[PDB]
Amino acid sequence: MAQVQLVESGGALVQPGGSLRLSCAASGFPVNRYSMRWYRQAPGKEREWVAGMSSAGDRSSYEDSVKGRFTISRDDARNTVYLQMNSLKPEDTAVYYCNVNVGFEYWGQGTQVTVSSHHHHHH
Numbered sequence: 001m002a003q004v005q006l007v008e009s010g011g012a013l014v015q016p017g018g019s020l021r022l023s024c025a026a027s028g029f030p031v032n033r034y035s036m037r038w039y040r041q042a043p044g045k046e047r048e049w050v051a052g053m054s055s056a057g058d059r060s061s062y063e064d065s066v067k068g069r070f071t072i073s074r075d076d077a078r079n080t081v082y083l084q085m086n087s088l089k090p091e092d093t094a095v096y097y098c099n100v101n102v103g104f105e106y107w108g109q110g111t112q113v114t115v116s117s118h119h120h121h122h123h
Contacts, residue, residue, distance in 0.1 A: 004028035004106050010083070011096050011111025016118060022083035022111070024098055029106065032057065032076030037099035038083060041110075042091070050096065051083065090115055 006029075010022030024036060034055040041047030051072035053060040060072045074081040081098075097110030 002028075003104070004100075004102070006098055006100065006106060006108035008096070008098055008108040008111045011113040013114040013116075014088075015116045016090065017088060020085040020088065020113075022085065022096065024081040024083070024108075026079050026081070029100060029102055030076075031074040031079050031081055034100060034102055036072055036074055036081040038070075038072055038096065039099065040094050040096050042094040088115060090117065 005027035007025035007027065009025070010020070014020055035053035035057065036051075038049070038051035039047055040050045050066065050070050051060060051062060053072045057074075062070065069085070069087050071084045072081070073084070083096075085092075092113060092115045095110040095112045098108040100106045
C-alpha cells in the first residue's frame with residue numbers, strides 16, 4: 001500500500017498548570033520534508049489554528065496572542081513532530097488533530113485533552 005499513516009498521541013486528561021509535550025509519529029511520510037499542520041476545535045465551538053509551519057522547515061507561524069504558548073517542531077533523526085505547550089489554560093479542553101498534503105490528502109483524526117481545575121496536590 002502506497003499510503004502514509006499519521007500517529008497522533010499526547011492528548012489526554014491532564015491537570016491544570018505545568019507543561020505538556022505532545023508528539024506525532026510519522027509513517028511513510030517524511031517529517032523533515034514538510035511541515036506539520038496543527039489545529040484545535042472546542043466542543044460545540046468553532047475550530048481555531050494552533051500552529052502552522054512551512055514545508056521548507058524554516059520558521060513557524062503563530063499569532064502574537066498564541067505565540068510563546070504553542071510551538072511546532074519535528075526531528076528527522078527520530079521522525080516525529082513535537083508540540084510544546086506552555087502556560088496551559090482551562091479553555092485548553094478540546095481536541096487536537098493534524099493534517100498533511102503530500103501528493104494525496106492525508107489527515108490523522110484528533111486527540112482529546114482535558115484540563116482539570118485548581119486543586120490541592122496528593123499526599
